[PDB]
């Protein structure tokens, strides 16, 4: 009531874009949207679709 | 009368009814047995290479259209063409750079139409020519603006860079190196031809 | 009364109430078993090739619209029609060429509307008819004028040549060859018929 | 004394930046200069970086 805590539902591979690194901008906009409300919590669904482990390359 | 175009666009298809400040490639035609056999192989290999340039335009348009209809602000130089109109016959012409007096900045600015109008005529012997246009887009990014516009136009420059990375392939690279030596000999013979004629 | 057109335009669709100076193809209709079977196959394959001529006109208008609305100066011969009006019934008529007494220049001039209203009727059995039309455009460039006009019209001649090179394709080339001879055996029988009738 | 073994020195991928054809032109000028001054030695320091595997 006094501090409405917001939510941001974000999936894994939607952030990972084509181009080159505009996937970075897809979360730059999200993070600057994290500062329009203060009580802001970020959800990254399927984070392994963004940052998986080094296998051989 | 003639178009007041400053960039060196011209080739076997057209675009030769132009006049600029720096070097311009206006070429359909402008001992003896070596000259005539040179002309014969010039006609033949130039027809083949113009077919190759048309194929290059065909495989470039699929991305060029997206990169032309995505953004429009960089499809027009920040400095209006009229300020460069009066120097054809504030702004002063260097070797190729135009210098302004108020600030003193150098701009190699285009309007993003020049690559496809260049391949309309066709002298892109090498995907290095597209690399030059992409680096020159990066140059327009660098010359004018603050950090935000510079970084966004650099992202676009990197987009054209990935595109040319896919366009540039080793077999096309070797074919284009062969035609690159061919057309360096061609441009040498053409400059000596316009100097002697 | 009849139109005062000197060019040999005529086909199954129409435009066959004309009179010119040189040869003219007015063709709707002008032992015996071979004659009647010949007329039967003439009707059949003429309908098929006339549909093919419509298809050729369809794939040709896509470039002739641009090539006819881009320039208008070469859509009108330098010598007015009136000087050629009085020779139907200064300028003298050779085999097909018109000679002018004052200067002595020879002009195979057209008005750039002739090819499309030729395909309106339709006798373009081969792409070589379009090749000859573009070569006649080049002839108009060569015969009358100086430097700049000649090279500009040659630039358009090259543009039209590049267009027909795309229109001319090996499958269509071999089909066109099948109809070329089809219309050849047709033209020989047509002159022999108009001579015997 | 009268002939010069003029020595050309290059570094590891000093020619090779991320731009593709600048290295091409640099090699062209390098070998053209080697052709002009007829006796010449061209050295590629750290050639395992200029020609990696």
Curated annotation (Swiss-Prot), chain D:
It is found in: Chromosome, Centromere; Nucleus; Chromosome. Disruption phenotype: Decreases the level of CSE4/CENP-A at centromeres. Decreases internucleosome spacing at protein-coding genes. Decreases localization of RNA polymerase II to the histone HTA1-HTB1 gene locus during the G1/S transition. Decreases HTA1 RNA level. Heterochromatin spreading downstream of the silent mating-type locus HMR. Decreases cell population growth; simultaneous disruption of proteins required for maintaining centromere and kinetochore function, including CLH4 and CBF1, enhances the growth defect. Phosphorylated by CDK1 and casein kinase II during S-phase, which leads to its eviction from histone gene promoters and promotes histone gene transcription. It comes from the Eukaryota. Functions as an ATP-dependent nucleosome disassembly factor that helps evict canonical histone H3 from the 5'-end of genes upon their induction. Also contributes to kinetochore assembly by cooperating with SCM3 to load the histone H3 variant CSE4/CENP-A at centromeres. Provides a chromatin boundary function at the 5'-end of genes that restricts access by RTT106 and thus prevents ectopic spreading of repressive chromatin into coding regions. Also prevents heterochromatin spreading downstream of the silent mating-type locus HMR, this function is independent of the tRNA boundary element. Belongs to the AAA ATPase family. Present with 172 molecules/cell in log phase SD medium. Interacts with CSE4/CENP-A. Interacts with SCM3. Interacts with SPT16. Interacts with POB3. Interacts with the casein kinase II complex subunits CKA1, CKA2, CKB1 and CKB2. Interacts with RNA polymerase II. Interacts (via Bromo domain) with histone H3. Interacts (via Bromo domain) with histone H4. This is ATPase histone chaperone YTA7. The gene is YTA7. The chain holds residues 474 to 526 of 1379 of the full protein.
């Amino acid at each position: 009531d006094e501090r409405k805590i917001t939510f941001f539902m974000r999936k894994g591979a939607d952030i990972l874009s084509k181009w080159v690194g505009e996937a970075e901008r897809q979360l730059r906009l999200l993070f600057e949207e994290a500062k329009k409300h203060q009580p802001s919590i970020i959800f990254f669904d399927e984070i392994d679709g963004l940052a998986p482990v080094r296998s051989s390359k | 009368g003639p178009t007041r175009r400053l960039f060196p666009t011209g080739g076997p298809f057209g675009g030769n009814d132009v006049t600029t400040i720096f070097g311009k490639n206006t070429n359909f035609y402008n001992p003896l047995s070596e000259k005539v056999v040179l002309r014969r192989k010039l006609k033949s290999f130039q027809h083949q290479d113009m077919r190759l340039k048309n194929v290059l335009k065909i495989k470039l348009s699929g991305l060029m259209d997206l990169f032309k209809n995505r953004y429009k602000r960089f499809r027009k130089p920040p400095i209006d063409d009229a300020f460069l109109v009066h120097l054809f016959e504030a702004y002063i012409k260097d070797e190729n750079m135009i210098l302004e007096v108020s600030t003193g900045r150098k701009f190699f600015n285009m309007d993003l139409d020049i690559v496809e109008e260049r391949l309309w005529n066709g002298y892109y012997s090498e995907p290095k020519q597209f690399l030059k246009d992409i680096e020159l887009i990066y140059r327009d990014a660098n010359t004018i603006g603050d950090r935000e516009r510079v970084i966004k136009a650099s992202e676009m420059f990197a987009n054209a860079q990935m595109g040319i990375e896919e366009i540039s392939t080793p077999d096309f690279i070797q074919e284009c190196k062969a035609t690159r030596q061919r057309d360096l000999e061609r441009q040498e013979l053409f400059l000596e031809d316009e100097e002697k004629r």
